[PDB]
Amino acid sequence: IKDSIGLRIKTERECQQMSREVLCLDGAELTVRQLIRIEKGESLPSLDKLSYIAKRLGKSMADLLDHIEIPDTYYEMKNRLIKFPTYGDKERVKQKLDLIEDVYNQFFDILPEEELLTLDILENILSFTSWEERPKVEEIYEDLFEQVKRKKKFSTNDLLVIDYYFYHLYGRKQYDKKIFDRIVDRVLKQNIPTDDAYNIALFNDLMAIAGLKISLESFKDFLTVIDKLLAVIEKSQFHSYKPGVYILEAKYELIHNGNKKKATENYDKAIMFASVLEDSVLEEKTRAEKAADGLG
């Protein structure tokens, strides 16, 4: 940064066609030796020097220093990572893992530490297989996991690690029920923002919460979970996610209420939606779950 600003000062001075001798007739406030050394980039320009050279230039310190930035192309690739449901497909997750490496091999240095954290967590979620073959949520993030259990408001990253905590809990008895029920409470109380990534992250949690609930045959505040889901979709306009909710209402009406008349229609509305979205892998999977639950 030393040589960058030193070049910026010189270059701007060249455009103004002003000389070093012109800037300070007295040379008291700025020794000519100092400026020359600064333009060489060998010496860091002290803040008082920056204030002077800008006061003379007739340009504020803010505007030209504000202009490092983050390129828009990264957000395009990030959009490809979170706004494209893979549904655990073989090739759709490999394509994303290849993309994550590409993002790392193209933006690793510029991103804020929170952004690299975001990339790292979901990468573990994508490459996730089962609870037996992969490390616990604590073992990989002890410090972060203990903070989110006591924290009131979660961020986008906190929703991700909690989501990973859900993946490690599926099909797994011998679990701390209280930690689970505390977390699902905090999650439901989270206010829906305008940020897409937060809602998507929150959506993944809510789907995961209901997922574990069905497997463990627990239906406490199940209505509340869906109400959150629908509220998210209404505010985020993620109509592409709405088929997933229909699947949840299906297995609920099938297991809890013991209904098959309304369980079939919920599957039906999901299959139809998966069709109009032209999502092949979605359609064939959700209709396979229909037959798996002893339906047409």
């Binding site: 990572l81 979170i82 449901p85 893979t86 549904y87 655990g88 497909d89 997750v93 979901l122 979620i125 994508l126 996730f128 089962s130 859900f166 993946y167 599926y170 099909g171 998507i200 959506f203 993944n204 789907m207 995961a208 997922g211 996610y241 997933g244 699947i247 949840l248 999977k285 959700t286 779950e289």
Partner: peptide
């Protein structure tokens, strides 16, 4: 883990 849990 079921397919409809992975929305990523």
């Amino acid at each position: 883990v079921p397919f409809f849990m992975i929305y990523y």
